[PDB]
Amino acid sequence: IPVGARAEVGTTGYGGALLWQANPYVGLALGYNGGDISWTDKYDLDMDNNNVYLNAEIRPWGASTNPWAQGLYIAAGAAYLDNDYDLAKRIGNGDTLSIDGKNYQQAVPGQEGGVRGKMSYKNDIAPYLGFGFAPKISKNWGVFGEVGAYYTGNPKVELTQYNLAPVTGNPTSAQDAVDKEANEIRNDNKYEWMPVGKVGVNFYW
């Protein structure tokens, strides 16, 4: 029987979790994170998230009566993961945009130009490692922040561009810039981990 529950928002979506406490040092969080968010600004940013996680939570000082200490935890578990991240930059007449640190402008002044990229993480099980801070404000309420990563392997990447030419003094074409940036994300092994952050509120019945 669970000891409470939390609401949370972050980079893998929003939702919440049920929470058990076997003892002051060891607890469990079974949660759902989802959503389909868009921020349209020039820039369009999308997230489609649908995931379920189960983590053990180790509070090394879980019995402390100093809340800063008892607040601290390590999180280890696994999750079913499905997350898409989209970014689209579009430029109109006279505008500029950048790829992989380099700048581009319209290739022909008629039509808009742009870049559209997608990254997808789909894993039936991906192990998780995280570090959180979750101090109790009282018995009933707390707030928390958590940071960590899933071991997913490199994600799928689409990276395309429309109607783009380098600005003068940039030797690299739009195509090479997107090919290089995509490949880094597919092959480079720092990208075998999906980093994550979230924050939220804990309630304890």
Domains of the chain (ranges; CATH) run 1-205 (2.40.160.170)
Nearest to 202 by CA among 66, 50, 64, 71: 71
Distance CA 120, CA 157 (A): 7
Report, in this order, helix, strand and coil percent for the chain, each rounded to 5.
10, 65, 25
Letter for the amino acid at 1? I
Method by which this entry was solved = X-ray
Contact call for residues 131 and 148 (beta carbons, < 8 A): yes
- Resolution in Å, one decimal place: 2.7
Contact call for residues 46 and 103 (beta carbons, < 8 A): no
Block residue for tokens 């099980």: 125
Q: Is 12 helix (H, G, I), strand (E, B) or coil?
A: coil
Q: Is 67 helix (H, G, I), strand (E, B) or coil?
A: helix
Block residue for tokens 């880094």: 184
